[PDB]
Design a protein around this motif. Structure first.
Motif, short mmCIF file in Angstrom:
data_model
loop_
_atom_site.label_atom_id
_atom_site.label_comp_id
_atom_site.label_asym_id
_atom_site.label_seq_id
_atom_site.Cartn_x
_atom_site.Cartn_y
_atom_site.Cartn_z
N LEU A 155 28.43 48.85 48.10
CA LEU A 155 29.55 48.00 47.73
C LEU A 155 30.82 48.29 48.53
O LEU A 155 31.56 47.36 48.86
N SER A 156 31.07 49.55 48.86
CA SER A 156 32.35 49.93 49.46
C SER A 156 32.59 49.28 50.81
O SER A 156 33.72 49.28 51.29
N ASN A 157 31.54 48.74 51.44
CA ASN A 157 31.68 48.16 52.77
C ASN A 157 32.66 46.99 52.79
O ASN A 157 33.21 46.68 53.85
N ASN A 158 32.90 46.34 51.66
CA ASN A 158 33.87 45.25 51.56
C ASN A 158 34.92 45.62 50.53
O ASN A 158 34.72 45.39 49.32
N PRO A 159 36.06 46.18 50.94
CA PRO A 159 37.07 46.59 49.95
C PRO A 159 37.78 45.43 49.29
O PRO A 159 38.39 45.63 48.23
N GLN A 160 37.73 44.22 49.86
CA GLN A 160 38.44 43.10 49.26
C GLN A 160 37.84 42.71 47.92
O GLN A 160 38.56 42.56 46.93
N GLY A 161 36.52 42.53 47.87
CA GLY A 161 35.89 42.21 46.60
C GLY A 161 36.07 43.31 45.58
O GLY A 161 36.30 43.04 44.39
N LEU A 162 36.00 44.56 46.03
CA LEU A 162 36.22 45.69 45.13
C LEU A 162 37.63 45.63 44.55
O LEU A 162 37.82 45.88 43.35
N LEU A 163 38.62 45.30 45.37
CA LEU A 163 39.99 45.26 44.86
C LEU A 163 40.23 44.06 43.95
O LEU A 163 41.00 44.17 43.00
N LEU A 164 39.60 42.92 44.22
CA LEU A 164 39.69 41.82 43.27
C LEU A 164 39.11 42.20 41.91
O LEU A 164 39.73 41.95 40.86
N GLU A 165 37.93 42.82 41.90
CA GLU A 165 37.35 43.25 40.63
C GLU A 165 38.25 44.27 39.94
O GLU A 165 38.46 44.21 38.72
N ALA A 166 38.81 45.20 40.72
CA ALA A 166 39.69 46.21 40.15
C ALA A 166 40.94 45.58 39.54
O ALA A 166 41.37 45.98 38.45
N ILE A 167 41.54 44.61 40.23
CA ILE A 167 42.73 43.95 39.70
C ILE A 167 42.40 43.23 38.41
O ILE A 167 43.17 43.30 37.44
N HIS A 168 41.27 42.53 38.37
CA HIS A 168 40.92 41.82 37.14
C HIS A 168 40.75 42.80 35.98
O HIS A 168 41.35 42.63 34.91
N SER A 169 39.98 43.87 36.21
CA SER A 169 39.74 44.84 35.15
C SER A 169 41.03 45.49 34.68
O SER A 169 41.26 45.66 33.48
N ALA A 170 41.90 45.87 35.62
CA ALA A 170 43.13 46.57 35.26
C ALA A 170 44.10 45.64 34.54
O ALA A 170 44.63 45.98 33.48
N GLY A 171 44.34 44.46 35.10
CA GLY A 171 45.37 43.58 34.58
C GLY A 171 44.86 42.54 33.61
O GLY A 171 45.51 41.52 33.39
N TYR A 172 43.67 42.75 33.04
CA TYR A 172 43.26 41.99 31.87
C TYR A 172 42.65 42.95 30.87
O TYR A 172 42.32 44.09 31.21
N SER A 173 42.50 42.50 29.63
CA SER A 173 42.14 43.42 28.56
C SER A 173 40.72 43.24 28.05
O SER A 173 39.91 44.17 28.16
N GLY A 174 40.37 42.09 27.48
CA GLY A 174 38.98 41.92 27.10
C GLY A 174 38.11 41.03 27.96
O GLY A 174 37.20 41.49 28.66
N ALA A 175 38.46 39.75 27.98
CA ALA A 175 37.52 38.74 28.45
C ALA A 175 37.42 38.74 29.96
O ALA A 175 36.36 39.00 30.53
N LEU A 176 38.54 38.47 30.63
CA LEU A 176 38.54 38.54 32.08
C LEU A 176 38.36 39.97 32.56
O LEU A 176 38.03 40.18 33.73
N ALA A 177 38.56 40.95 31.68
CA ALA A 177 38.37 42.35 32.06
C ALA A 177 36.90 42.73 32.13
O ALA A 177 36.56 43.68 32.84
N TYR A 178 36.04 42.04 31.38
CA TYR A 178 34.60 42.25 31.50
C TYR A 178 34.18 42.22 32.97
O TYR A 178 34.40 41.21 33.65
N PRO A 179 33.59 43.29 33.49
CA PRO A 179 33.30 43.35 34.93
C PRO A 179 32.25 42.34 35.33
O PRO A 179 31.51 41.80 34.51
#
Lengths: 101, 101
Positions: free
Chosen positions: A1-25
């Motif tokens: 996964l680490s080969n593309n940091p952009q997708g990783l950072l999008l997922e990280a932003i969603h998880s961090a800055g949402y709480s339940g629903a959009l936070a679901y990975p």
């Protein structure tokens, strides 16, 4: 996964800055992957893949042909009451992960 | 190393709170482990193992024989003065590392 940091950072932003629903990975962490199973998929699909939330869209197809071939294949699905969408609040802070140099 | 979360937390406290001399890690991260060499260690020792930083302590050894044996083997070191102490300043800090547990 680490080969593309952009997708990783999008997922990280969603998880961090949402709480339940959009936070679901979205990419199924390893514990979830180990826990996942065929009967679990069966139950999830049977509970969610219901008629009031299905759209069959064609791009280059005559409507009469499409409906005449699709009605004998979808008209007998059970009519469910369309359970409500999840809630999610935005308040969220920082996600920080350390990797390569 | 992950099997000992207490030491990991202590090291994380040091790294995330201190800045510089005391924030330098104690357990050789992956890149530095790959990069270290015999000449690197030799130069580090030759520059840091000086006489004003040698204390030969003994537990149950008579002073006379101890000094009679350890004078020929130590009195010939160069008299390099003590370098300036590595200064570090304490700040706040938050370290956070997800993992399986």
């Amino acid at each position: 996964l680490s080969n593309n940091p952009q997708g990783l950072l999008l997922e990280a932003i969603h998880s961090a800055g949402y709480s339940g629903a959009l936070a679901y990975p979205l990419l199924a962490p390893e514990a979830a992957l180990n826990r996942l199973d065929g009967p679990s998929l069966e139950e999830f699909v049977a509970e969610n893949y219901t008629a009031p939330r299905m759209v069959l869209a064609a791009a280059g197809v005559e409507h009469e042909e499409l409906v005449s071939i699709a009605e004998p294949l979808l008209s007998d699905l059970p009519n469910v009451p369309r359970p409500d969408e999840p809630k999610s609040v935005y308040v969220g802070g920082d996600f920080r992960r350390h990797g390569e140099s």
